[PDB]
Amino acid sequence: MQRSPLEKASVVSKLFFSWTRPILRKGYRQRLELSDIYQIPSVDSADNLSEKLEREWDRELASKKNPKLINALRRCFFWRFMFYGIFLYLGEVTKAVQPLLLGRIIASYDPDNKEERSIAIYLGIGLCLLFIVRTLLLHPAIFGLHHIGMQMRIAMFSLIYKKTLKLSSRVLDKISIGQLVSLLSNNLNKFDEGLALAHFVWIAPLQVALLMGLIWELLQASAFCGLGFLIVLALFQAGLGRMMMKYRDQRAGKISERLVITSEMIENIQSVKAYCWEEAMEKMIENLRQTELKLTRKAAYVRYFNSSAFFFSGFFVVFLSVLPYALIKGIILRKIFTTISFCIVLRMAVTRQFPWAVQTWYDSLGAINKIQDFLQKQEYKTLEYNLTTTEVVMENVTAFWEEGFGELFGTPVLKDINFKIERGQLLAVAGSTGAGKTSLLMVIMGELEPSEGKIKHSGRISFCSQFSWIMPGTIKENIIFGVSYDEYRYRSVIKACQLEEDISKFAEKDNIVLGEGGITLSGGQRARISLARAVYKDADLYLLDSPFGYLDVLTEKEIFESCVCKLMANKTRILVTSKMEHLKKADKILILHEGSSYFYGTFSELQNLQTWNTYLRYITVHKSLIFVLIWCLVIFLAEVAASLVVLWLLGNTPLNNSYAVIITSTSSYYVFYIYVGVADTLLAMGFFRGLPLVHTLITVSKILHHKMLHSVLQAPMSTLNTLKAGGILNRFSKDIAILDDLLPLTIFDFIQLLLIVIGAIAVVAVLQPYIFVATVPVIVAFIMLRAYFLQTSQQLKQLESEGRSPIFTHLVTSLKGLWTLRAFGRQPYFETLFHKALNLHTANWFLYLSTLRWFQMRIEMIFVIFFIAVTFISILTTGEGEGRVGIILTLAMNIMSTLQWAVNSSIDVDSLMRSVSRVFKFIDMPTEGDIWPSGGQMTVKDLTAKYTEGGNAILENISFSISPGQRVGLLGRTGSGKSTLLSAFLRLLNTEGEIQIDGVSWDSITLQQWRKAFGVIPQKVFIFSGTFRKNLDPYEQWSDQEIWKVADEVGLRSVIEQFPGKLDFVLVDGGCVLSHGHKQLMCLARSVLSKAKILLLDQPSAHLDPVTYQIIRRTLKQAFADCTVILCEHRIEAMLECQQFLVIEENKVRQYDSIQKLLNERSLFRQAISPSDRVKLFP
Ligand SMILES: Nc1ncnc2c1ncn2[C@@H]1O[C@H](COP(=O)(O)OP(=O)(O)OP(=O)(O)O)[C@@H](O)[C@H]1O
Ligand SMILES: Nc1ncnc2c1ncn2[C@@H]1O[C@H](COP(=O)(O)OP(=O)(O)OP(=O)(O)O)[C@@H](O)[C@H]1O
Ligand SMILES: CC(C)CCC[C@@H](C)[C@H]1CC[C@H]2[C@@H]3CC=C4C[C@@H](O)CC[C@]4(C)[C@H]3CC[C@]12C
Ligand SMILES: CC1(C)Cc2c(sc(NC(=O)c3cc[nH]n3)c2C(N)=O)C(C)(C)O1
Ligand SMILES: [Mg+2]
């Protein structure tokens, strides 16, 4: 990491921006190098800006009665804000005095021997000094304001991330990820570039006042008559402004809902492919875009008029100003031209510098109000009493989930519970699915607050959750979790939890980079990592929320008899389980039922009791766009043609005529200048040209989004495991929102300005030849410098754009596994780990932003250097009568001002066109590519299974056969590959060989027609945000009578009726409202509905007790009558059902007929069988 070159630089280097020079010549030749990226300055790091504003915000909360975040921002930015403002004012004031000096220098060409001839050279010196001071005065202040804006945004982002870690469990149901992602995604680049525009609120009026006097000098009455039009027009723009911000708050609700559905489906696509929900998910996201794009088009139509009230305004402000003066006194051309030159600045001042400033003040204060509202929310309170005898006591506790019933006090999830726990003994928390075993642990931790009751234990606590959580990094970084490493401790934990088997099979033994959630690992490997993280942590109380769900009986007994009773057996460790073997060794038991203590005591008592290609693939998506652009061009040619014959007639005039005074001298070199100043309205796009162009460009972004979401869904599994969660979420959030909002209007201004310059040069050139030759040296200079800059700029804009993914990826896992962070107390780790993501983004963004003003300053310096050269060549070579050299040259240099503005607009288009480039990389991803399943007999031959292309083979030379309508058991040790065998049939991972069914093979049929044969219950359950009927069938094939008919057999009768809207209750936060057992029953009903003659069950019973498991065999015997069943399951009770058994080990299979034979070979596995389950197998 090289340190920032801004730190050690002369004022000249910081004034002329020479310190950014190295990376351009480095980036021009070569591809950009990671070494060449500079470390952020010490001023604008995450830590200090957090430090600074954190200190002010609590001072603000302490002092005032109703605090405001703007007051906290004021005390740390206001002086450095206003310091740049006064330079930006003087830099803008010097534009208004330019027509006074230049005006006379144009007038001095007139042969009528005026006094100007005399002063011209002094204006010549003065006007050169005038340009030099502005070029220096403006750009440092803009960079200064961008630099302050960047510091404000980093400070607020840091305060949101600290606030969200202390946020209440009550609030998490209300605020989804789409709320947080959208808030950051909106502000990320909009807030920084805004503070350049923000000052023109108070610059523009003083500018209007200063200009109105200078016009009042020329025209006494009419100038006010003109101004009235701009007051008339300014109120119309303010009307569009308030209209456009009411269309944006209707849409803002819709965007959040789209991101939560898009995130959820791509996070667990492996289920989405198994069920075959492509059309279902696409049609769902399609319906959310309908409302969004309706509001986008409406907000875009009002935005055009706001950005089209400057070009049209031009002609009418001058016309209404000169007309009244013309009728009474008469006018000289020298008076009309002067007015034109003042007018252009005034409109710039009042029609694109005033409506862009206020619009920035609304958005900034709106964004700050949402952040301030987000900071003032219900916090997770902590109340831990270190002083204790280490006796975990609970007495007379009740608890409700929601606020309403709890506050008004629906049945509470706990009531009338009480227990006493000495230090060095484990509690056996037992009961049926929906007893409140997770809820009890949530009360012990303090996530769920009890209405009536009291809890007390010491602050130190460990927590192994039911849904296992894996942060992004190495298995080591997961197991130790933000603390020092201890060789003796870490190794002893891994042998206790016995991951030694699973860790040794990996290529990189200890440390492999796991993704967001850890889908590289199976269910058993995640559970034991979560348990290892819990065990490696040291605390007074260990909470274990059923870690033996996904484990086989051999692993379950060894890990129980190796960790729970060996590694920790001198402390209070409440556990969740439902087996006799675990309750025997346990000292105290608590059997919950319907949120009530059925029993409490001991085991003995209980028995007693009972680039060109990017710019070309974006124009040829939609045919309307190419018709509209051709339609604009033919109308453009017509007005260029119309103006040419107007100026032909006007110039060729043979001229009491007070109306407009002209002489042979003045005529020739004012008539052309008048046209150049009024060529911004004549060659303007109307509501015939501008409307459809905006309409089509939004239609392009709708088509691009459809293709992108379509391509991501049907791409192969390897390409989707390669990329992160935040990388997916970044594009659909930020990159698709740029094609909807900014990019359609950014192209409009670029085309408008480009047409004005082309058409201006065209009419001037055809009528007077040498001005085209005069423009060419300045034209080539701008194109030269532009081509040079874009080589570095395009490479910085990709490192910066892809630099966003760290911030989002981190924000997902932070919010996803929030309960474990506060359990272990690892906020200081995650805050400092989050600061690195901001510093990374700042490092790239600051670099790109600073490179731009270099370009912005250099192109103005080029224009100044040429204008200085033109002015003295003009003034010095002026004849005794009628100097023609200056007449030709200054006309060109009036055009180059409009082109300078167009080149700056061109760089804003290329920066936004990067986004469309990054969308097209997702569109260009590879594709995975009588009655048929009558009986459902499978024949596998020479099968091989591996995830990565040319990696390690998980299964090797697999072959076996199932006869029709036969139930088949599948089993083996955790991490054997059982899922891989189920994924091999669906062929989600790439395989070799053939699996032929009912005498017909893979290659005979398409893949989507193939996957409709099977009926899947996956290991990881997927419940998207919607109604129960939407989850149970997205296609809406089955009736309510049908779904209610299924709902009783699998037993969601009592589950659904609990909630208000029966089959209309909108599930949230990935179905957090339902318990873990109900999610397994949800996937069962989903498979029961889909009548399939083959069906695949990946551990249907995960954390179901023996009572709930009767439903599984009830529905498996009755509903699945004739169809063949592959049952992948750990519990031995399930083996009584199915005939043939498939055992997996050593990357190969073995098939067995009877159970007696199979269990006979293996002794340790037969000795793991429960005594209650041993009397069933053997009679
Ligand atoms: N966030 C929540 N909001 C509202 N109700 C909830 C929430 N979480 C759980 N519940 C309800 O509380 C009851 C008990 O939940 P809990 O998860 O503690 O049961 P459990 O015994 O742990 O389930 P399982 O045996 O499947 O692990 C369930 O009926 C469930 O509907
Ligand atoms: N997506 C993947 N990419 C790479 N390797 C994988 C992937 N999924 C699984 N593996 C590897 O394959 C091994 C076995 O895979 P699989 O997920 O089928 O185990 P399993 O039998 O389902 O486990 P469990 O018994 O816990 O359900 C894992 O131990 C892991 O090393
Ligand atoms: C800083 C600004 C807002 C102050 C007010 C505007 C200034 C520019 C205005 C207010 C009064 C104006 C003056 C009013 C009358 C005359 C006399 C005339 O023969 C030459 C111009 C001159 C001298 C004007 C120059 C511009 C002027 C000085
Ligand atoms: C904002 C807007 C309504 C934009 C606008 C105008 S005026 C105008 N077009 C015309 O005059 C016109 C004439 C022929 N074809 N178009 C527009 C517009 N965008 O078309 C004004 C009034 C300044 O203000
Ligand atoms: Mg539970």
Ligand SMILES: [Mg+2]
């Ligand atoms: Mg599995």
